[PDB]
Every structure is written in structure tokens, then in C-alpha cells.
Amino acid sequence: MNGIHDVGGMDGFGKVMYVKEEEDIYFTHDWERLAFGLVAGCMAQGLGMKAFDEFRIGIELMRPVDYLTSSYYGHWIATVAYNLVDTGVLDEKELDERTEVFLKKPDTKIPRREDPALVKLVEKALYDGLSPLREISASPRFKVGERIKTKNIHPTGHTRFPRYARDKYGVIDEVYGAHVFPDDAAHRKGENPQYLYRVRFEAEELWGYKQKDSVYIDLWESYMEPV
């Protein structure tokens, strides 16, 4: 989707706010910590999301005005709420009513529950991860060194094909193997893995600019065609 999140190549966002890393605080509010716990806790059990594809599309679907103002972990709260309602784990009305309760009475007490088995399950996700590498019977369409042209496609659902890289000539840098295909998996339509490639693009091709700059981007096979 050609959304507010796809910012590569945009102007007007201003200077980068430099901060010494030692001063670059991770969390300034407890709800931000909670957001991390909710995301990993849910994902570890496949609740609302099995991996990060479903996670990302929920953020991309945010109202643009919210995306730019929520702060980072606000994105995470948005996608947890979106996905849990979308999959039927939570009811939207019940969630809205409970949200109102905490709005009006922020000091409302949180229920306590110890579940050591769930802790171990969450640990498994944290340490074992969720590698999207798969195998398919087909061979790669493209080879290292091949010049390709990326497609001019405009998926209305999730994609990992940034707008700035569309309809561009590039050179295959590596064939990684087949990876779970985000454009399908984000919408729960199957892993449907495709070959994933790293592709190098020159500044002159991307922007018509004159410096010794390049961008390496990972692209799924269906994002590209031969020349």
C-alpha cells in the first residue's frame, strides 16, 4: 500500500534529531514497555500475528495523522489492537469500552496472573526466532549480476516493494533463497514463499542524482522482471 509509512525519498521531514547514544533513552513511559510485552507476548503464541508480516500491515493501516503523532510504540499498540480484533481474539466494542475505562480512570488496577509455562513459551520465541526462510521446488528466475527492471505495481494490500524503487533498473547482488511472501502472509493468505534477492540500485537510476551513492534493497521475485 502506498501509505504514509513508505517515506523513502520524501522531502520535508527535516533534520535528524541527533542524540548521543548514551543519552538515547529507550522508554520514557511504562505503556511503551507494555507495548513491547504485548507484541512479543501475542506473537509468541500466534495471537493476532504469526510473524511480522501481519504486524506491519496493522501499522501501515493507521490513519496518517496517527502514524505521525502516536510516537513509535503507539504504532505497536495500534497493530496489536487491529490484529486482535481482525482475527477475533478481541471484540472491538469490549476493547473500546475498556479503553474508555482507563482513559477516565488511569489508575485502574491491572489484573495479576503468574504463568511460568507461558514465560518459557515466550522465551522460545525470543531465542529461537521466526525465520521466514523456506524451500520451493522452482528455480530462481534471476541470477547474480543480472540486470532486472522492477515492476510498476501498486498493491493495495501490504508490500515490501518501496515506491522509490519501483519501475527501476537494478542488478541482482545475491539470491538469498525462498522467503515467506509478505504481500500474501500479512493478509493470512498463506506463506506462499518466493525467491528473495538483494538488488543494487545506483543513485543516478533512483533519483537522477550525481554522487557515488547506491541503495541495496531486498526484493521478492514477483516485484521484478527480466530485461
Partner 1 sequence: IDPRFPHHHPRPQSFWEARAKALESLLIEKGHLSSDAIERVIKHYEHELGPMNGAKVVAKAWTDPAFKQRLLEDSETVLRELGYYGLQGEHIRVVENTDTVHNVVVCTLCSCYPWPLLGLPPSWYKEPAYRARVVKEPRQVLKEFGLDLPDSVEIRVWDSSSEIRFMVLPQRPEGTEGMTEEELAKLVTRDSMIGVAKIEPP
Query: Should residue 10 be labelled a site residue for Cl ion when binding is judged by CB under 5 A?
Result: no
CA distances in angstroms from 2 to 6, 60, 129, 196, listed in the order given: 7, 9, 29, 21
Query: Should residue 154 be labelled a site residue for a copy of itself when binding is judged by CB under 8 A?
Result: yes
Return the residue of 16, 19, 25, 65 that touches a copy of itself, per CB under 8 A.
Answer: 65
Pick from partner 1, a copy of itself, Cl ion, none: which does 156 bind, CB < 5 to 8 A by kind?
A: a copy of itself
**C-beta separation of 167 from 149 below 8 A:** yes
Query: Should residue 226 be labelled a site residue for partner 1 when binding is judged by CB under 8 A?
Result: no
SS3 string, 139-191, reads: CCCCCCCCEEEECCCCCCCCCCCCHHHCCCEEEEEEEEEEECCHHHHCCCCCC
**C-beta separation of 123 from 87 below 8 A:** no
Instruction: Look up residue 139 and give its three cell numbers.
Output: 528455480
Closest CA to 155 of 181, 193, 179, 134: 181
Q: Which residue stretch of 12-20, 70-78, 92-100, 188-196 sits at the interface with a copy of itself (rule: CB under 8 A)?
A: 12-20
Is 6 annotated in some ligand binding site? Answer: no
Pick from partner 1, a copy of itself, Cl ion, none: which does 59 bind, CB < 5 to 8 A by kind?
A: partner 1
Site residues for partner 1, 195-214, by CB under 8 A, read 196, 198, 206-207, 209, 211-214
The residues of the shown chain that bind a copy of itself, judged by CB under 8 A, are 1-4, 9-14, 63-65, 68-69, 152-154, 156, 167, 207-209
